[PDB]
């Protein structure tokens, strides 16, 4: 639950966009993981938009100040 | 020399087939490791010893 309450406190700090990309794509404030073109879908933009934004948020999720916090909750 | 708690013999064991929360799944894709789909129950030392 804790853990939870940091995806919560690490999770909010990032973009508007961001958070419903990965929200709304990982099945995590309803629960299924869905296709690209879901998610693109109620924005009405691309999938490429989608893959861009995600990707470059990957990047953002591996700065090391984040990261450090969330090593040990492995 | 031991202390309690390390690891006598390196034991492992197939998991099956499970699903996952999807956040710890995220943060498999965040760490980018997936680890297996085994079991990591190996044998350790009691403990004051």
């Known amino acids: 639950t804790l853990l939870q309450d940091q995806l919560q406190s690490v999770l909010d700090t990032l973009s508007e966009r961001e958070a419903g990309v990965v929200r709304l794509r990982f099945g995590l404030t309803d629960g299924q993981p869905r296709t690209l073109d879901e998610i693109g879908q109620v924005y009405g933009v691309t999938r490429e938009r989608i893959r861009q934004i995600e990707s470059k948020t990957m990047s953002k999720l591996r700065h090391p100040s984040r990261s450090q916090v969330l090593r040990d909750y492995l | ?49």
């Open chain 2, 1 to 49: 020399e031991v202390r309690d708690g390390d690891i006598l013999v390196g034991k492992v064991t197939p998991k099956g087939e499970t699903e996952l929360t999807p956040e710890e799944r995220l943060l498999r894709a965040i760490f980018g490791e997936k680890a297996r789909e085994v079991r990591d129950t190996s044998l350790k030392v009691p403990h004051g010893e």
